[PDB]
Amino acid sequence: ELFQTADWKKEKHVPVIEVLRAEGGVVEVKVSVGKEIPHPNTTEHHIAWIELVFQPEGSKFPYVVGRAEFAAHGASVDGPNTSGVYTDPVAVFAFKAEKSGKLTAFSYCNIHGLWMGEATLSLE
Amino acid sequence: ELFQTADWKKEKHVPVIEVLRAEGGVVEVKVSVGKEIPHPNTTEHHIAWIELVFQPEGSKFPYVVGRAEFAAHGASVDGPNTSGVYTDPVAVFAFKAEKSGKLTAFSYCNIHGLWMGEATLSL
Amino acid sequence: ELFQTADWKKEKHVPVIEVLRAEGGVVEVKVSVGKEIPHPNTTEHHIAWIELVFQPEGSKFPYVVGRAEFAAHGASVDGPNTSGVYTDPVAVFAFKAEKSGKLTAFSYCNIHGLWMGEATLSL
Amino acid sequence: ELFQTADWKKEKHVPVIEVLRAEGGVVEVKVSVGKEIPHPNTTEHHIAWIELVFQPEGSKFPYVVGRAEFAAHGASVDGPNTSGVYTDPVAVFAFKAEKSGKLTAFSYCNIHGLWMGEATLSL
Ligand SMILES: [Fe+2]
Ligand SMILES: [Fe+2]
Ligand SMILES: [Fe+2]
Ligand SMILES: [Fe+2]
C-alpha cells in the first residue's frame, strides 16, 4: 500500500490518534505527527497535512471528519528557513457522533510519502 | 468586498480568534464560528472551513498558517441529516513564531458566503 | 482497505485517469468521477474531491501532485438545490516530470465513502 | 486588504481567469498564475493554491466553486529541487451555471502573500 504504518514510539511519521473526549454525543480527537519523536519542519522537509476519517458502527461507508493543512515552513523573501513561522503538524477535530466506531488518520510528508494510523472510538 | 465582517457577539458567522498559549514563541490559536451565537450544521447549511493567516511585524507579506476543513454534515445513504456525524467548525492551529504580528482568519458558510476576523498576536 | 475499487465502466464512483499529454516531460492528467456512468451532484449527495498521486520510477516514495475540491452543490438561502451552481467532479493536473511512473487517484463521495484508481504514465 | 491586485501582463503573481467553454449547461473556467510572466516553482518558492469564487446575478451571497492545490515542488530525500516533479499552478474548474455573474479567484505564493483577480461570466 501507499500508506505506510509503523510503531509511533519508533517512527516519527506515524499520525498518532488521541481521544480527548467521547460522551454525550460530542467527541474531541487530537491527531499528531512526531508525538514521541519530533519530525523536522524546514522549507525542504515537512509534514503537509493530516486527514481524519470516522466510520460509525452500523454504517456501511466511512466519513471524512476533516482535514488540517500545515502551510508555514520558514519560507520567506530572505530565503528558506528565515521567516520564523513554522506550523506544527497537530490537529484537533471536534465533532458530534451518535455511536461508536473506527477512526483512521492519514498523513503526508513532502519527501517520505503517505502514512496512516488507526484507533477505536468508544462513545459514552 | 467578499469577506463579510461584524461583531461576533451578535453575528453567528464571524470567525472568533483566541490565543490559548504564547510562551517562548510556541503558539496555539483556536478559531471558531458560532462562539456566542450558534450556527447550524446541517447537510444543507453548514460552515465548510476556516483558514488562518499570520503576518509578523516587519514582514512585507502575510503567511497562511493552516486550513481546517469540516467535512461531515450528517449526509448518509438514508437521507440528509441521518448519519449522526457533524464536524464542529472549530480548529486549533499550533505554530512557532518569533515576533508578534497580525492574525487574520477566514471562513465560509455554504449559503451565507465569505467571512473574516482579526486579532493581534502579542508575544 | 478503506479505498474501494471497481471497473469504471460499471461503477460510477471510480476516479478515471486520462493522460491528455506527456510530451517532453510536460504532462497533463485529467481525472474524473462518473465518466461512463454519471454520478449525482445534489446538496445531499456528491463527489467532494479528487487527489492525484505520482511515483516516479527510481523514487522510493510517492508524491502528491495536487488536490481538487468540488465545493458547490446547489445550496442557497432559498434551500437545497436552488442556487444553480454545481461543480462537476473533473480535474486537470498539469505538471513536469523527468521519468515514467505510476499514477494513483483518490476520490470521496459524501455518503458512499472513499475510492481509488490507477494508471501508468509513460513519457 | 491582504489580497493583492495588479495588471497580469506586468505582475507574475496575478491569477488569470479564462472562460473556455459553455456547453450543455456546463461552463469551463481556467485559472492560472504566471500566464504572461512566469512564476518560479522551486522547493523554496512556489504558488501553493488557486481558489475560484462565483456569485450569480441576483444572489445575495458568493459560492466557492472549488480549490486546487499544487503539491509538488521538487523536494526529495536527495534534497530540494531533485525529484523532477513540479505542479504547474494551473487549474480548470468545470461547473453548472444557469445565470451570469462575477468570477473571483484567489491565490497564494509561499513568500509573496495572497493575490486576487476578477472576471465576468456571461451566459
Ligand atoms: Fe519526513
Ligand atoms: Fe450560514
Ligand atoms: Fe455516491
Ligand atoms: Fe512569489
Give A-chain residues touching D79 at CB under 8 angstroms: 44
The ligand whose atoms approach the alpha carbon of D39 most closely is 4
Give C-chain residues touching A64 at CB under 8 angstroms: 48, 108, 114
Strand C113-121 vs strand C3-4: parallel, antiparallel, or unpaired? parallel
Interior angle at CA C120, CA C115 and CA C121, nearest 5:
120
Q: Calculate how far, in angstroms, residue B50's C-alpha sits from the geometric centre of ligand 4.
A: 23
Residue D113 to residue B55: CA distance in whole angstroms: 9
Helix (H, G, I), strand (E, B) or coil at B13: coil
Contact B91 A91 (CB under 8 A): yes
Catalytic, A39? Answer yes
D29, D16 in Cβ contact below 8 A?
no
Q: Does B64 touch chain D (CB under 8 A)?
A: yes
Residue D21 to residue D53: CA distance in whole angstroms: 17
- Would you list the DSSP string of A8-51? TTT-TTSEEEEEEEEETTEEEEEEEESSSSPPP--SSS-EEEEE
Q: What sign for the dihedral angle of Cα C2, C8, C12, C16?
A: positive
The number of folded domains in chain D is 1
Residue D91 to residue D47: CA distance in whole angstroms: 12
Give A-chain residues touching B93 at CB under 8 angstroms: 87
Length of chain C: 123
The ligand whose atoms approach the alpha carbon of D111 most closely is 4
Residue B51 to residue B89: CA distance in whole angstroms: 11
CA distances from C96 to A44, A58, D37, D51, D85 (A): 19, 44, 18, 22, 5
Residue A59's CB is within 10 A of a number of other CB atoms, namely 20
Q: Which residues contact residue D23 at a Cβ distance below 8 angstroms, ignoring those fewer than 6 apart? A: none
Closest CA to C97 of C22, C31, C29: C22
Q: Which residues contact residue C8 at a Cβ distance below 8 angstroms, ignoring those fewer than 6 apart? A: C14, C16, C35, C36, C117
Can you say whether residue D112 is alpha, beta or left, with left for phi > 0 and alpha for psi between -120 and 50 degrees?
Answer: alpha
Residue B81 to residue D41: CA distance in whole angstroms: 43
C32, C20 in Cβ contact below 8 A?
no
Q: Which residues surround ligand 2, an ion (CB under 5 A)?
A: B 109, 112
Query: What HEC string does chain D produce?
Result: CCCECCCCCCCCCCEEEEEEEEECCEEEEEEEECCCCCCCCCCCCCEEEEEEEEEECCCCCCEEEEEEEECCECCECCECCCCCCEECCEEEEEEECCCCEEEEEEEEECCCEEEEEEEEECC
Closest CA to D66 of B2, B54, C73: C73
Q: Calculate how far, in angstroms, residue C44's C-alpha sits from the geometric centre of ligand 2.
A: 17
B109, B13 in Cβ contact below 8 A?
yes
> For A98, which DSSP code?
S
The ligand whose atoms approach the alpha carbon of A113 most closely is 1
Q: How distant is the alpha carbon of residue C9 from its chain centre?
A: 16
Strand A113-121 vs strand A3-4: parallel, antiparallel, or unpaired? parallel
Burial class (CB in 10 A: 0-12, 13-18, 19+), C38: exposed
D47, D89 in Cβ contact below 8 A?
yes
A68, A107 in Cβ contact below 8 A?
no
Which of A61, A110, A114 is facing C113, going by the closest CB pair? Answer: A61
B31, B105 in Cβ contact below 8 A?
yes
Q: What is the resolution of this structure in A?
A: 2.0
Cell 498576536 belongs to residue = B121
Residue A71 to residue A47: CA distance in whole angstroms: 9
Which of C44, C75, C110 is facing B45, going by the closest CB pair? Answer: C75
Give the minimum alpha-carbon distance from B76 to chain C in angstroms, rounded to a whole number: 5
Query: Residue A43 is part of a domain; what is its CATH number?
Result: 2.60.40.730
Give B-chain residues touching C80 at CB under 8 angstroms: 43-44, 80
Question: Which amino acid is located at C69 in the chain?
Answer: E
The residue among C12, C43, C108 with the most chain B CBs within 10 A of its CB, best to mutate, is C43
Contact A1 C2 (CB under 8 A): no
Residue D106 to residue D15: CA distance in whole angstroms: 7
Give the up-direction half-sphere exposure of residue D16: CA atoms within 13 A in the CB hemisphere.
19
CA distances from D123 to A36, D56, D76 (A): 56, 10, 45
Residue A70 to residue D86: CA distance in whole angstroms: 19
Q: Does A88 touch chain B (CB under 8 A)?
A: yes
Q: Torsions phi, psi of C25, nearest 5?
A: 70, 20
Closest CA to B37 of B81, B89, B106: B89
A65, B89 in Cβ contact below 8 A?
no
Residue B71's CB is within 10 A of a number of other CB atoms, namely 25
Given the residues C69, C98, C112, C118, the one annotated as active site: C112
B62, B55 in Cβ contact below 8 A?
yes
Question: Which amino acid is located at D111 in the chain?
Answer: I
Closest CA to C61 of B107, D72, D12, D29: D72
Interior angle at CA C13, CA C7 and CA C15, nearest 5:
75
C92, C67 in Cβ contact below 8 A?
no
Q: Which residues contact residue D108 at a Cβ distance below 8 angstroms, ignoring those fewer than 6 apart? A: B64, D47, D48, D49, D114, D115
Closest CA to C38 of C90, C108, C78: C90
Residue D21 to residue D6: CA distance in whole angstroms: 26
> For A5, which DSSP code?
-
Which domain range does residue A107 map to? 1-124
Q: Does C114 touch chain A (CB under 8 A)?
A: yes
Q: Calculate how far, in angstroms, residue C47's C-alpha sits from the geometric centre of ligand 3.
A: 7
Nearest 10 degrees: Cα torsion A94, A104, D43, D113: -20
